[PDB]
Design a protein around this nucleic acid. Structure first.
Ligand SMILES: [K+]
Ligand SMILES: [K+]
Ligand SMILES: [K+]
Ligand SMILES: [Mg+2]
Ligand SMILES: [Mg+2]
Ligand SMILES: [Mg+2]
Ligand SMILES: [Mg+2]
Ligand SMILES: [Mg+2]
Ligand SMILES: [Mg+2]
Ligand SMILES: [Mg+2]
Ligand SMILES: [Mg+2]
Ligand SMILES: [Mg+2]
Ligand SMILES: [Mg+2]
Ligand SMILES: [Mg+2]
Ligand SMILES: [Mg+2]
Ligand SMILES: [Mg+2]
Ligand SMILES: [Mg+2]
Ligand SMILES: [Mg+2]
Ligand SMILES: [Mg+2]
Ligand SMILES: [Mg+2]
Ligand SMILES: [Mg+2]
Ligand SMILES: [Mg+2]
Ligand SMILES: [Mg+2]
Ligand SMILES: [Mg+2]
Ligand SMILES: [Mg+2]
Ligand SMILES: [Mg+2]
Ligand SMILES: [Mg+2]
Ligand SMILES: [Mg+2]
Ligand SMILES: [Mg+2]
Ligand SMILES: [Mg+2]
Ligand SMILES: [Mg+2]
Ligand SMILES: [Mg+2]
Ligand SMILES: [Mg+2]
Ligand SMILES: [Mg+2]
Ligand SMILES: [Mg+2]
Ligand SMILES: [Mg+2]
Ligand SMILES: [Mg+2]
Ligand SMILES: [Mg+2]
Ligand SMILES: [Mg+2]
Ligand SMILES: [Mg+2]
Ligand SMILES: [Mg+2]
Ligand SMILES: [Mg+2]
Ligand SMILES: [Mg+2]
Ligand SMILES: [Mg+2]
Ligand SMILES: [Mg+2]
Ligand SMILES: [Mg+2]
Ligand SMILES: [Mg+2]
Ligand SMILES: [Mg+2]
Ligand SMILES: [Mg+2]
Ligand SMILES: [Mg+2]
Ligand SMILES: [Mg+2]
Ligand SMILES: [Mg+2]
Ligand SMILES: [Mg+2]
Lengths: 97, 166, 191, 95, 140, 15, 26, 148
RNA sequence: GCUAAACCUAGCCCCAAACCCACUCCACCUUACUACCAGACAACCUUAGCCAAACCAUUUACCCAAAUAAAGUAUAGGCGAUAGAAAUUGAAACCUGGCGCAAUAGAUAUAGUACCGCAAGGGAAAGAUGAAAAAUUAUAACCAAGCAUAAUAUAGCAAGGACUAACCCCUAUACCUUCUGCAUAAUGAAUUAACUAGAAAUAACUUUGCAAGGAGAGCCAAAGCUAAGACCCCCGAAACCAGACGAGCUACCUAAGAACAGCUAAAAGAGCACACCCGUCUAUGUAGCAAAAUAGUGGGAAGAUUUAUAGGUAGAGGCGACAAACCUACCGAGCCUGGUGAUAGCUGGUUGUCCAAGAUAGAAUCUUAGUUCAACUUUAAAUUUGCCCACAGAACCCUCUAAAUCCCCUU
RNA sequence: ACUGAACUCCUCACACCCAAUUGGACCAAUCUAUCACCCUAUAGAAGAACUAAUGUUAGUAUAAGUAACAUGAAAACAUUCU
RNA sequence: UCUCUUACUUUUAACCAGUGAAAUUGACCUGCCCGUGAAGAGGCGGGCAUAACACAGCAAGACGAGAAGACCCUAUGGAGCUUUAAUUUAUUAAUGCAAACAGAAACCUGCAUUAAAAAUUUCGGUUGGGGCG
């Protein structure tokens, strides 16, 4: 019980597809391009996460002040509660002071 | 679910050599989803375990339990199946080799108790398995006699060595 | 890892729909005490410590560290007979079969990374030959990176590319600390 | 102490420490004596002499005040004609 | 990424295999068997001291049994064999008392003779010479 | 010592 | 259906050993 | 995490709390140690050893007038106008070994540093720069990109 | 060999991009889904509280329309927990993605359906052959607990040492948690499978880069600076506030109705006694027929009676022949949703292997169920003495003329 | 005299018997990069490991085949009887 | 009712047939005496007893089971209620003034003072069984 009786379907990974053969390209755009571009500008994803890093509370705070006016009512309410809980957890709970 | 009992009637052995002895016939038969308790059904299967095919029918015909009539119908169609399909010459030259009962799928209903309480009651179903082997039933094992006990006790005293030494 | 963004995200006990009501009274029922049906203990509840995406793993190594890695990567290629210098990427024929057979005769390797000075000056002979290939990649000089070189067995460079690399790489070894980002005009930048 | 602010997500500084203490760049914290302005008529001149002195906090107190202030207060300042300028660095200190 | 235990079956079989010979539900239920396999292993480690202790006690009883057949006590045999520089442990003497009855009787005679020599020396004041078997070989 | 009453909790009928 | 291959592969070897016990080869 | 209490449950009190008694930092009286700290003027010191070090390496050419722009352009100083900097002050460190004829303009200068420069034939003049113009002087290139 | 066990899709999550749907016919604000008569009916009004301040009473973060920086700075504040700018600086921007999930997961979802509640509202469970089912002669073997095959033989945490041999002999006071100390007759666990609990980089340390400079504007620098690695859990209250939903049970009231044999008496909140209502005593029952009943015995039974129907009063309240009664089977303050993952110095739990170091001076505290500091303990680092202890030396008013310390070179 | 320990010795190997806490050395499975190609290597990453929370869901035991439950009689199943 | 119970019928009961729960359960191969122990032992020490085995009774034990029981204590945990506890008059009502008017007044609004009715919050530790700390 809890373990399959048959082998999993075989998985074949294309080590030389378009994405892997061209992964990491232009990571030296700033060094080799007279510093016109920055490698952080090559990041694709959320507008509040391009070229930025932080903990869970900092991500929620940054997301609320950048796309908070565009979020859905349910999602915005959940984000506000998450900030309230994380504020209480980090600033009032822990092993070290 | 498992239905290996039915497949046991489809195994075909290779033809026997002229010097090989007569191999008794093996018949596997069962009935599924019998509205009866496997605990109560066990006493009926144990009663006819080791009995002859005709002797077992005699016990099940005058037995007051409901499953006795259910098992009898299983033996009657298995006895007919033995001669018709399994090349058994005499229908009475059979004995019950294996006779057991198995748990079947059971529905779950609610039995209402007092004070707004409840208790889940199942509608128990059971299986019955029977195996028929051509030939007379094996003789019952004789009770162990005093000579056998004396022979065994003396044999124990002869197999003892000096332990924890050379 | 610097451009990795993890989109995995789970719903905590505050985001699972429903579960605001206490199931049974605290005492008298003879069962375990629970305040909601969406707690991590319950089936179908939230996850106590799960991913909270989207998450960024962005960090920047110092510029001299990233530039030094290219020199070390280039040193390994030359020291291990995996670096080849060329004058131009002009092939006699645009047949991709010609490129594969040429690399096998010289025993370059299973994979070769081709580098040109610029993207607009790449000869059409090699562009149409590497377009149908998977182990032979054609990239500009600015697209040079450590991961691509380490993935590929053999590296091929042109003469203009070599001069380009030395100007860019040695510039880090003798330079002042930036008062303002180098994208702004300087006395001697760009070179 | 607020380890993560609700609008910037960064550590804050307790203003009670800043007003009551002075930090030298060498790591020492300089404070006043509790009660140097209270009931001076019943205190001997020797007692009052050490009450109006500036004293250094010990290791435990100094480590406590380093966590309650941000890095803006630990930077090196170059105020013109600073009374405590000469005390921002240790001299002939071993171990 | 969600990680789940996929080889939990192998983690419980390495403990249940040591419990296959037990009785009751503690041979197939992991929760019940793990508390019994641990105690079985603990008893295994602590029984290594008892086995050494019990072997020596068994040897003493066998040595005592054979000495009484020759009219000697266990202290009279072990004690007087030491004074003859015969360094035989209980394992050998127990084996000798079972498989070499004639050799054991010779040792009993030697121990009895040495025992009698000490009594004679105890009656005298040292003027008489020591017993023939009471001489000790010196090693330098 | 208030009167203690525990209301029985029924289970869903689908089971 | 838990993902992975090492646990499923390892279990198959154990099953084959039981097959060699219930029905040993000649 | 230990045995029970506020340690294991993660409900430890705030930093500086002493279990109920008046905290150590609270009981210390207030004094004007840092009062008006953000309005005090700061000047990055410039030693004659540092100035002579720049001249001998060619980072600061003595043939041209020396102002705050040249010192920043030579990476001799790092002025932070946002950090209440008002320029550089010329200190007297290394006056004995200073030997160069320069025309350097510094916001503040000590009496000995002034004497040391004029002894070798140099000229020293002190001028004031407001914080707004200070950032323009330190980094002229970013200012010229604002189109103002 | 039964029950079972496995079997991958449905679909979903997070981003990006782009601003979305809403007249076939008929019906639908009256009792919605009802073809068809004189109406007058109007929307707008600071959130609070939990919580933190170890109580609490001022106070306590909540997108407000440019990221970064200025900056956690100026200021605000039982100047205390905490709150917190601006001038100024200026940003790239290519939807067609995944070191996301794979049926106890991912949306609750096969579905807001079944079902539950008068209503608001709560809220599921599960599916699995194959190219072909117009191949069922089918989708073979092995796998949890539970059973069956196959009941049991002196004796004892059920095992270990063993043995020719299952037992017989010898040895052995279950586990976790909480306590100074649990075989303890203290807590938890019938069992199987799955799920379920340590998130943060200020300082310091470690390892690279560069170096009086470091850094891809800002920031720091009297060897620093940049980057990485590496430390901070889960479940549980009784409560509080806001907005809704409830008087089809019940408390009282309103509208217009109905019921009350017979006998004795008299124009009776009269007597006896049915229907009817009520529930005194006793017994049965106690997961019961019943989350308050049965049998017998009782109180009233022309009235302050009983009762059907419709309407009204709603929680900071209603209502009350005041019992702190009743307000939809837990009312000293209803239920539901939201704040809410409220909080809990309290209880319980806190998941792989191996090794090492490792226990009992105290002070403060609305504090003695806690916390902080010290003592002790750990690692790393630096340095040179540490321990043991020969004389000498340490008070008088004081002969319990005490045992013995402190100091202390040698060793 | 002898008996008598995990003390000591002997043959051999030695990191291999403390709560809390602290320092380590390793490591299951999973995903990714690159290998590997009967299931592994080196790295990166994390919903990363359950004999226990009157834990949650599901299955099945135990109490237990126990408590409890039910159909007036004859008959031609027309009917009749109690 | 009792001295002092007894007989009978019915239900229950027990047996045969059918259907088929619930609390409970660490694992048990589940003995007595004496002693010991976290102070009340089926499991430890010393003695004694002991083939296995179901059914029907019994209620001394398993500190038996059932609702973290009642009972005292603890919490800088709640709530109701009372008040000469503390903090307030926002709200309501009555006056005063200003305002606004007529020529006097009222309504309204602002600011005050009185009450009313409420709102928020707390109940320091130490020691003391027959006290008045
Ligand atoms: K669900
Ligand atoms: K406490
Ligand atoms: K009893
Ligand atoms: Mg019923
Ligand atoms: Mg009912
Ligand atoms: Mg909720
Ligand atoms: Mg709520
Ligand atoms: Mg709760
Ligand atoms: Mg979920
Ligand atoms: Mg010994
Ligand atoms: Mg605990
Ligand atoms: Mg009409
Ligand atoms: Mg009409
Ligand atoms: Mg508070
Ligand atoms: Mg309180
Ligand atoms: Mg689901
Ligand atoms: Mg099984
Ligand atoms: Mg024994
Ligand atoms: Mg309200
Ligand atoms: Mg009504
Ligand atoms: Mg009448
Ligand atoms: Mg009357
Ligand atoms: Mg009434
Ligand atoms: Mg009464
Ligand atoms: Mg009634
Ligand atoms: Mg009457
Ligand atoms: Mg109504
Ligand atoms: Mg009434
Ligand atoms: Mg009263
Ligand atoms: Mg009362
Ligand atoms: Mg209610
Ligand atoms: Mg909590
Ligand atoms: Mg140790
Ligand atoms: Mg106090
Ligand atoms: Mg040993
Ligand atoms: Mg030793
Ligand atoms: Mg050793
Ligand atoms: Mg790995
Ligand atoms: Mg986990
Ligand atoms: Mg498990
Ligand atoms: Mg559990
Ligand atoms: Mg029974
Ligand atoms: Mg019965
Ligand atoms: Mg009947
Ligand atoms: Mg029956
Ligand atoms: Mg049950
Ligand atoms: Mg027995
Ligand atoms: Mg006893
Ligand atoms: Mg005993
Ligand atoms: Mg019995
Ligand atoms: Mg009874
Ligand atoms: Mg307290
Ligand atoms: Mg308040």
């Amino acid at each position: 019980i809890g373990i399959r009786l048959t082998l999993p379907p075989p998985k074949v990974v294309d080590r030389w597809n378009e994405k892997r053969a061209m992964f990491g390209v232009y990571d030296n755009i700033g060094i080799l391009g007279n510093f016109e571009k920055h490698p952080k500008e090559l990041i694709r994803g959320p507008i509040w996460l391009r070229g930025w890093k932080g903990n869970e509370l900092q991500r929620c705070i940054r997301k609320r002040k950048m796309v908070g006016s565009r979020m859905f009512a349910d999602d915005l309410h959940n984000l506000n509660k998450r900030i309230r809980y994380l504020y209480k957890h980090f600033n009032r709970h822990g092993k070290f002071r | 679910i498992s239905r290996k009992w039915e497949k046991k009637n489809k195994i075909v052995y290779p033809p026997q050599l002229p010097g090989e002895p007569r191999r008794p016939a093996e018949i596997y038969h069962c009935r599924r989803q019998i509205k009866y308790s496997k605990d109560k059904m066990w006493y009926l299967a144990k009663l006819i375990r080791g009995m002859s095919i005709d002797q077992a029918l005699a016990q099940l015909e005058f037995n007051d339990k409901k499953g006795a009539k259910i098992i009898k119908e299983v033996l009657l169609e298995a006895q007919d199946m033995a001669v018709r399909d399994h090349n058994v010459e005499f229908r009475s030259n059979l004995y019950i080799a294996e006779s057991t009962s198995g748990r079947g799928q059971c529905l779950k209903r609610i039995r209402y108790h007092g004070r707004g309480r409840f208790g889940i009651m199942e509608k128990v179903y059971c299986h019955y398995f029977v195996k028929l082997v051509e030939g007379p039933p094996p003789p019952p094992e004789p009770p162990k006699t005093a000579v056998a006990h004396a022979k065994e006790y003396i044999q124990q005293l002869r197999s003892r060595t000096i332990v924890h030494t050379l | 890892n610097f451009k990795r963004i993890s989109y995995a995200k789970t719903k905590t006990r505050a985001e699972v729909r429903g579960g605001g009501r206490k199931p049974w009274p605290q005492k008298g029922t003879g069962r375990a005490r629970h305040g909601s049906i969406r707690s991590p203990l319950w089936r179908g509840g939230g996850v106590a410590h799960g991913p909270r995406g989207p998450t960024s793993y962005y960090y920047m190594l110092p510029m001299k560290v990233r530039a030094l890695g290219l020199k070390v990567a280039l040193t390994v290629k030359l020291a291990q007979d995996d670096l080849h210098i060329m004058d131009s990427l002009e092939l006699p024929t645009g047949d991709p079969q010609y490129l594969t057979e040429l690399a096998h005769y010289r025993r370059w390797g299973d994979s070769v990374l081709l580098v040109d000075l610029t993207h607009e000056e790449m000869p059409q002979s090699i562009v149409e030959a590497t377009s149908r290939l998977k182990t032979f990649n054609l990239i500009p000089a600015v697209g040079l990176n450590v991961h691509s070189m380490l993935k590929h067995q053999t590296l091929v460079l042109t003469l203009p590319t070599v001069a380009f690399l030395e100007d860019k790489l040695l510039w880090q070894d003798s330079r002042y600390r930036p008062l303002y980002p180098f994208s702004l005009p300087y006395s001697d930048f760009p070179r | 102490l607020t380890y993560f602010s609700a609008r910037k997500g960064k550590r804050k500084t307790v203003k009670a420490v800043i007003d009551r203490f002075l930090r030298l760049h060498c790591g020492l914290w300089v404070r006043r004596k509790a009660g140097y302005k209270k009931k001076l008529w019943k205190k001997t001149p020797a007692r009052k002499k050490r009450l109006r002195e500036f004293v250094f906090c010990n290791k435990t107190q100094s480590k406590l005040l380093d966590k309650m202030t941000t890095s803006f207060w630990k930077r090196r300042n170059w105020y013109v004609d600073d009374p405590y300028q000469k005390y921002h660095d240790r001299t002939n200190l071993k171990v | 990424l969600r990680n789940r235990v996929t080889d939990r079956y192998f983690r419980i079989q390495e403990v249940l295999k040591h419990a296959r010979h037990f009785r009751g539900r503690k041979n197939r239920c992991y929760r019940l068997a793990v508390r019994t396999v641990i105690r079985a292993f603990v008893k295994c480690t602590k029984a290594r001291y008892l086995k050494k202790k019990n072997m020596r006690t068994l040897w003493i009883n066998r040595i005592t049994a054979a000495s009484q057949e020759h009219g000697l006590k266990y202290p009279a045999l072990i004690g007087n064999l030491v004074k003859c520089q015969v360094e035989l442990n209980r394992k050998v003497l127990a084996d000798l008392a079972i498989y070499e009855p004639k050799t054991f009787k010779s040792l009993a005679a030697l121990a009895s003779r040495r025992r009698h020599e000490g009594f004679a020396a105890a009656l005298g004041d040292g003027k008489e010479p020591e017993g023939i078997f009471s001489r000790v070989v010196q090693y330098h | 010592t208030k009167k203690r009453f525990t209301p029985p909790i029924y289970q869903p009928k689908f089971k | 259906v838990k993902k992975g291959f090492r646990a499923a592969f390892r279990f198959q070897k154990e099953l084959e050993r039981q097959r060699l016990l219930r029905c040993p080869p000649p | 995490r230990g045995h029970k209490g506020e340690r294991q449950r993660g409900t430890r009190p705030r930093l500086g709390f002493e279990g109920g008694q008046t905290p150590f930092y609270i009981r210390i009286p207030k004094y004007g140690f840092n009062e008006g700290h953000s309005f005090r003027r700061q000047y990055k010191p410039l030693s004659l050893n540092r100035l002579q070090y720049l001249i001998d390496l060619g980072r600061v050419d003595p043939s041209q007038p020396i102002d705050l722009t040249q010192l920043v352009n030579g990476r001799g100083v790092t002025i932070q106008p946002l950090k209440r900097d008002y320029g550089v002050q010329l200190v007297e460190e290394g006056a004995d070994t200073f030997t160069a004829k320069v025309n350097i303009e510094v916001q503040l200068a000590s009496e000995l540093a002034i004497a040391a420069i004029e002894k070798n034939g140099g000229v020293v003049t002190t001028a004031f720069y407001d914080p707004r113009s200070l950032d323009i002087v330190c980094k002229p290139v970013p200012f010229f990109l604002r189109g103002q």
